[PDB]
Design a protein around this nucleic acid. Sequence first.
DNA 1: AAAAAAAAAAAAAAAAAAAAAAAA
DNA 2: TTTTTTTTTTTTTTTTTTTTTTTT
Lengths: 246, 246, 246, 246, 246, 246, 246, 246
Amino acid sequence: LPEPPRFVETQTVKQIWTSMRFASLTESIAVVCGNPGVGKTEAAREYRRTNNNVWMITITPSCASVLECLTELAFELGMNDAPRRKGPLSRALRRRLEGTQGLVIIDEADHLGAEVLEELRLLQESTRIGLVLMGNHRVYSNMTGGNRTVEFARLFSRIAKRTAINKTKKADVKAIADAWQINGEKELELLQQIAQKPGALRILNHSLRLAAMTAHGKGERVNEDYLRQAFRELDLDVDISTLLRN
Amino acid sequence: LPEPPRFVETQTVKQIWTSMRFASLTESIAVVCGNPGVGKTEAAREYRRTNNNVWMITITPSCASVLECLTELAFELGMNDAPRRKGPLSRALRRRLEGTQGLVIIDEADHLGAEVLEELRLLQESTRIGLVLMGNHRVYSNMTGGNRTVEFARLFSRIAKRTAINKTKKADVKAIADAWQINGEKELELLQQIAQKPGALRILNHSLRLAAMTAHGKGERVNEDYLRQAFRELDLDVDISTLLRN
Amino acid sequence: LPEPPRFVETQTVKQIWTSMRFASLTESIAVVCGNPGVGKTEAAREYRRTNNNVWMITITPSCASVLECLTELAFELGMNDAPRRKGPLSRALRRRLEGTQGLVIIDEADHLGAEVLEELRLLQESTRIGLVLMGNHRVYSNMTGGNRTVEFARLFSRIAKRTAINKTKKADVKAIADAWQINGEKELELLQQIAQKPGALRILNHSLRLAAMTAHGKGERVNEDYLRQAFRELDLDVDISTLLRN
Amino acid sequence: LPEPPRFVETQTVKQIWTSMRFASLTESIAVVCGNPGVGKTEAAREYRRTNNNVWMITITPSCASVLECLTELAFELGMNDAPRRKGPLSRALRRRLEGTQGLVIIDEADHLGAEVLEELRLLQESTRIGLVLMGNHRVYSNMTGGNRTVEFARLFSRIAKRTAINKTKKADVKAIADAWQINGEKELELLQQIAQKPGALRILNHSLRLAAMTAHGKGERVNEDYLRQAFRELDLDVDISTLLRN
Amino acid sequence: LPEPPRFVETQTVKQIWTSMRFASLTESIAVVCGNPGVGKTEAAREYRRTNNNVWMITITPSCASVLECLTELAFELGMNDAPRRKGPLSRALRRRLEGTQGLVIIDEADHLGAEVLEELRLLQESTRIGLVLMGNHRVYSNMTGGNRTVEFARLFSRIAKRTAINKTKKADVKAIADAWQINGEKELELLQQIAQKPGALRILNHSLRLAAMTAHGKGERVNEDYLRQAFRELDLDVDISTLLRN
Amino acid sequence: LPEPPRFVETQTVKQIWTSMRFASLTESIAVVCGNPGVGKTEAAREYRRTNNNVWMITITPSCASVLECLTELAFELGMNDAPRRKGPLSRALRRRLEGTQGLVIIDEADHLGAEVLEELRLLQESTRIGLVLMGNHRVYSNMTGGNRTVEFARLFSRIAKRTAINKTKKADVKAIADAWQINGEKELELLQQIAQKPGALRILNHSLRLAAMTAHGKGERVNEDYLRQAFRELDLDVDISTLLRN
Amino acid sequence: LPEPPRFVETQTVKQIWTSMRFASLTESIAVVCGNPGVGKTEAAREYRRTNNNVWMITITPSCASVLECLTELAFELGMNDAPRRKGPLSRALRRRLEGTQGLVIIDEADHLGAEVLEELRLLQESTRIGLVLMGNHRVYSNMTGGNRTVEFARLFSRIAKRTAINKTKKADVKAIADAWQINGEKELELLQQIAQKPGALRILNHSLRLAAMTAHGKGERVNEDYLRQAFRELDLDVDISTLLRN
Amino acid sequence: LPEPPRFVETQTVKQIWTSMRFASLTESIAVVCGNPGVGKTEAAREYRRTNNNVWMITITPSCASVLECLTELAFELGMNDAPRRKGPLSRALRRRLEGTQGLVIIDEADHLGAEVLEELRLLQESTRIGLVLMGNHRVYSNMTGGNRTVEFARLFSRIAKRTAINKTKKADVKAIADAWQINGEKELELLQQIAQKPGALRILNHSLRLAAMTAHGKGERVNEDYLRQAFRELDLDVDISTLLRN
DNA sequence: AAAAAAAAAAAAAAAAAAAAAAAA
DNA sequence: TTTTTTTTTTTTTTTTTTTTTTTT
Ligand SMILES: Nc1ncnc2c1ncn2[C@@H]1O[C@H](COP(=O)(O)OP(=O)(O)OP(=O)(O)O)[C@@H](O)[C@H]1O
């Protein structure tokens, strides 16, 4: 019956916000790398919404070059009239970002190459801001493993605080259930089981939203039956590569 | 005598449409991969024609790169003046697709590489639309099987609902026959046999259209004789790799 | 004395033309694969000459990639200003070929790989034209034999009608002899014997042209003697790999 | 005393020129494969010099790929600004060689692989010219011997006339002696003996040139003594793999 | 006391140089293969130093492929900007080497395979230069012995003059002693005995240089004692595979 | 109490250094092969440390191919940006090593095959450096024994000085004891007895270090008791293949 | 009732740990070979878990080659992006393992061939770590017995400490019983008798776990009856090769 | 009249299932070997069908090597894109089977060699699954009899539970008859007599199916007459050896 | 012990034609 | 006009190796 909670401050969200606060305070690059669906992107979005002078961009493979990444950062800054060349855009970003003590949150930073990462590191160094590189466990692995540990030496030195989010914690699903008004022990155990699945918090949110929608359509309250039905839906455990083969 | 039916709503078509509706509502990526000639592309085309704010593109090996796939998507959107660079085109697609709650159906998505699939994934994430990847069993097999379950981890994580179409069901051919005005039990059995041949509805439609054309030319009604003649035609059981040796 | 016939409509030519007409009407891929020198390439050329909206290309190993094959198809279309990229060229071909109900005859289609064949079948599907793959037994043997029957599954399902030309039939050589004004039973027997040689119809044409040229030079009518002299020429039965050894 | 004859029209040269004329007239591939030092390369060079619209290239192992062989052919054609890709170069060759009824002489053609030979065959077919292939017995042995006769089936069918040069005939050495002003019966017998050695005509030419140079230096006429001295030179009968052992 | 002679024109050097001049004049391939330490490499180096338009390369097992061998030849030619592909490099070598009547000296030619030797032979044929191949008995043994006499048939036919250097002759050591200011009969006998050892002239030069260095250090003239001490050094007659066992 | 000596100059070390100086001066290949644990590798390492323009590499079975051995040599040279192909890397090594009169110490050279040994031999010949092969008796045994004395003929001829180290000499262990401050006659006899054990100097060093560590832990001086305890340790006389059986 | 102990520090475990510590300190190869089921692999695993900079790999017959064994070691090191060639992987291992003074425990080292054992020995030499070879009596028997004591001479010389585990000792089973809370003298005697059976500690662990499971299911305490039932199970005394015959 | 039962849960099937459960629980290898046709393979297949995370492969002499056996195991796992090398395939199997608590049943394991059995044992050890060897008495006889019991010592120690199936038991045929709706005492005696014949359950099933087919053809019920006729059929007592010679 | 066959397959160039948008 | 870039790619192979097995 109640409207779904758009965002809840879980333990993982609190840790990620602490990492971003440290990055903005010490003015050094921070790495927030975790497995998919652990609450990273929504934590970054909520941090951007609730904190002034915080700018967040995502790195698509189309915006994975220096000019396109700088243009994305400028568009996030509101500089809709930014120059379309590398040098003028870099200088405009240096002028606009300086003196703000901001926090440029590079979501999906694993797509960044060496040149773009060097450009971002130089921008942070000459701007004195926080640069939170996000993504998956490839963010750290890109800066280590042979020739990459000497080319990325300066960038790896800039990294002050690094956070690894392996799996969604029990406190996270507990907070989500509390925000969803769920009290049943069986329901909590089912939510915890859904959490350990790949795409942890995404699958948890999909199951919760589908169960809430089904209960609202049927005019009843959400219980373990609706959660189980939603989790059995989505065909998560379907080996569809073998279904077509056989 | 009556005109052939352009499209008939079948069980497989209904399941695919349910998957599309779920993808558009939940705003998460869905996978619809089936064996050749099971009714995926035609159902997707009918969904696009009957529903507003629904966009369909096909992924040829020529349009299997980020720039070309984004250009195809823009051309589907009606943005005939789309930018020719990766970044500006991605931003234009983000502005155009946002706020529509649409459904971008990526037909033949098995041709997409890691880069293009990742870019489309990020576009869906930052746009809040539904992405329906189609093709064959290789769509799922690309995202699983070793090193590709950690590179495609995030893309696998967004996948909300996946639908398997191994072979066309009896209800599908029953609906096709009813739309074709076929009542004979022998004709129904012949259609059922025709469906299980490789390329189920491709061969079924070819045989039905040929039988109808032959009957109309001869001025008679369609019966089992014309169906059998059409099925014996098309040389499906011709091992044309051995008619030359022997 | 009479001028040689540049082309004669025969049984093999009639069957190949029936296959091409079926491919153009049903708008589905057709395969015309036979042994060398049976009357396939000339049949396709004559079909292109006598039928409008019919475009024929040959696939050299240099034009066996997607970009080069699409450029060859565009040049056949008269699009001498075709784009030099894969995507723009594919879209230009989609625009130009659409609405014509044409017939793209891919001569020597055995050279095409999986990528180019997949691109061509997708172009045919999105354009609603007839695609005729031509060549030798490898045209079909490429789409069967293990992993190639599941990668080429959709393309194999596209194949509506497949025609095998193992050896030149008796009616074919009879029609050619009639076009060459040959009545002698011994001459017909010699022509039939010449046909069964490898490179059947090429050897037939070479022998006929040589005999006609020699008879015209000598001022006499063509008879079995000139045919025998021409056939004993061309050194068909010369084991030239053992003449050097011995 | 008289200057050596650069080229003399021997019987083998006449046969090779007849094969070349037949290939250029019939517009079909011809094979001229013989033992080393029989006069094939010099006959081809003289044919190219004395006949217009005749182009000759040689196939080194570096120029044994499609792009490099096509570039060699273009450079022979005088197209010094030829494109550096397979497709554009093939199309440029098709445009330039078409309408000339020329004769593309492929010297050392046994080095061509299946791909390059197939491309050259298709170029000849779509250009209507004469392709002449030479080398050693491996030219024919490449297109025969099991799987090689079904892969090279079309190319073997193209072959109109094939000429074998096992060893230089008595007429060849007779013509060479006549051009060299040699009348002695012992000298003719010695030249015939020199011919039967491996590398027949190369050894013959080397011996004749050495004898002529020695006679000119000594101010005398060439006789059997100088021929014998030259033939005992060149160390043909030196088992140098055993001279080091013993 | 006097400085050692860098190079002395021995009888073996004279014979090798005669072979080089014959190869450069006749413009045909020559082979100079002999046992280790006989003076072939130094003779080639001195010929390159004292004669213009003479190019010498050595064939390491890394430079035993067509591309690397052609790059070595180009670097010897001074073409420091040679193309890195097979075809363009071959054409550049053809253009640069043509019209010079040079002498491409292939040291250690026994490492060349069939492909590289074939390419070098065709380069010499189409360039009209002299190709000199050195090494050991395996240079000729590679072109004879079964299937190797028919694959290497043309290359064997090209060979104009082949020179065998089994062991250094008495004239060689006599000239070396004369250049070294050695007159004692015992010293001459000791040098002759040193020559017959494996690595004839390598050991001879090493012993002479060591004796001269020791005499210069002691301030005396070189005599039989110093040569004997040097020859007893170098541990030539040490069965070092048995000193460890016993 | 005193720190262990890192390295001590002994008779075997002096002989090996004399061989290395001879190889670097004469610019010819030298062989230093001996039984395991005789002081070869440490002598080579100390020579590299104390002498400029001296480069040492070891040949692991993975680095026993031409490309990998050349890459090892380049990495020893400091060429961290060396090319990854055989030819360019060989030319880079030729350029870098030339004009230095250096000494390439090939430790564990018995793992090199014919190809890699030939490449290193030609590199030394074209560079005028000292190639000091090292290892065990197989270094020489690979170059003799039938067909191996004619394939390795040039390499064997180039071997200037070969040094055999069967067992560590009495002077070697005497110098080691002097560096270890050992005066007891019983201790000297025990060290000599330890020397004759297999892995002579490895075992001697292990025993000395263990005795010194035990004495330092107990606060006493090293005597015969500690050496005997260390030698009874290390379980050299344990027939561990019969302990498990019994 | 109490949970089973995952690991107990037996006397054999203490001896194996002493050997591993000696190998890591002395930086020399150690051998831990014994009869199966004595407590070797679990001791190595526990040592790896409790000590930092300790890497343990196992040698399957598929991982018995140099490349696969080095890849196994790299994967144990944590570099999932290790190069797949012999040389680059060896250099990456040398770089990563250097400066750590680690302990690479090669479990099941009896499967290693001469090449792989030599490569691991050289890696340990150039890295200064402790290589602990494990397995059965064949580990030593591979390095002794004729030709194998001279090829494996260096590897045998580098073996610092070798430890024999013939059978599980009384102290080991006493410690296991103490960790299992077993006090009965009859139970202790039964455990001792179980130990002397082949596969000593595997059988002991299986019997103890089955007895504990049966007691927990029946709600009683483990005594002599449950251990006797478990030992009579597992069908150790079943001559199953004679049951089928009779 | 009733359809034949596909499977019946017999006493032998129950014992085999108990052995498989024990193997999957104790995480140790189990051996299920018996006489041919005693209900082993079908019991294993039924257990695989009715249990999750259970994988069954058969070992034929074609797939009796390490690479092919691992490929078959991977194909059973559904990894149709498994690597083709020994090491990568072994690592992929280790990653896929780890944590699944699986049970790999190796049907007809007597064909496995020492290398493949060792690889499977190490895979089970490092994966913690249940390896069920299967076949005939050779499975155990390969692990005992001299040198085979010291080479297979570890594998023999790994074997937890071994089950012998000498012949089909009375309860087995009783359950089969009950599932086949047979009540006659004479029919039961005939089935029992059929069971003791070689190929016990294969022969019993063949006789029962033939009798049922004959009864259905004649429209009567199965009784002793039909079973006797079926048993006299199949030529079980026909000695082919003596009829042909005589 | 010796010769031949059938793969996987992974790292490394390099090089050349085509727009193609934008600022002064 | 003048320039600045820029980026996107598409093909070019090229090699180096790395077993895997299979038989005689
Ligand atoms: N429970 C059962 N009910 C009916 N038939 C059975 C049953 N178990 C086995 N069979 C029959 O046994 C035959 C083959 O299975 P079975 O286990 O006897 O083979 P096997 O000789 O052990 O096999 P292999 O030696 O190849 O592993 C079939 O005819 C099958 O019908």
